[PDB]
Amino acid sequence: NHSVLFDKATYDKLLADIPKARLITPHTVCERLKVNASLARQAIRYLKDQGLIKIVGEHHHSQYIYTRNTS
Amino acid sequence: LFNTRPKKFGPGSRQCRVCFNRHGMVRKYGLMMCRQCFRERANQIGFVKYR
Amino acid sequence: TFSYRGVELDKLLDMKMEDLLELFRARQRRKFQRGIKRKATTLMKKLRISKKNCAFGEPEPVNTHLRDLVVVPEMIGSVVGVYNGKQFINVEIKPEMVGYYLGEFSISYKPVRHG
């Protein structure tokens, strides 16, 4: 069902798209988007390093669970 | 020539001293006792069952 | 043409069996190093001299019990009557058959046909 590459049309949107949402998970990326969970991990890892968003808890190795930054 | 294979190992090698039976051979601690033979004489050896 | 391996059938008889074993699977080598005594060693004579007895034009059936003997490119083009269980059956061993055991070729039992 799902798209595997970035899709560089939606990369310009994806800067705007994810910081709107209240829940930020593996699932909420492919909720808004229609791509496999794997991109979502490297997306929210990219949005840690470059972008805004922050960890709810320091970390875990299975369920990530970020918030919007609120700034 | 006749009347001997290599008879060194396996159940054909060895038999119960008391009844000459290979089957059910208890070889723990070097008993060489067929089980039918072993259970009835077990008290006389030393073995007393509890729990 | 089309002997058995990269080494052709002209050369193989010439090649020594001892160094020959290197070009073998896994059990033939194990069997050969352990091997052989008794009445396999008589068939190395007996199946060899079975070739000369016929006048020409390419044999006569030498009966055996040894299913466990592995065939060897010394003795190819011979014949071996291998034991099933009651009856002997004829096996003209070929250039292709080297590697395998004798009692693989002669079956023990009839396959099926229920009802």
């Binding site: - | 601690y29 039918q36 030393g46 509890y50 | -």
Partner: protein
Amino acid sequence: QRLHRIRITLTSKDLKSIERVCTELINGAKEKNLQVAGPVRLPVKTLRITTRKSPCGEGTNTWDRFELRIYKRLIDLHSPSDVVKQITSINIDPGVEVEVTII
């Protein structure tokens, strides 16, 4: 004579057979008043066989749980070997394997 060290092994099937020997040989040492330490009780090596009760397969598959028990116990001494031979040779017990050892 010379300063020696002796540590005598005791083994049997019964508890009651050794508890004679442990009480007797320490009092036998205390005739001469040698340097005795008390009897060091090692862990019990329980042997085990489980056979089926029935001769043949019939009925429910029931099992015996047979057991031996073996009791290693060690009387310690510091004394020469000529002295100890009087103590051990008198008061030998029925069916108790005993072996004297220097060091």
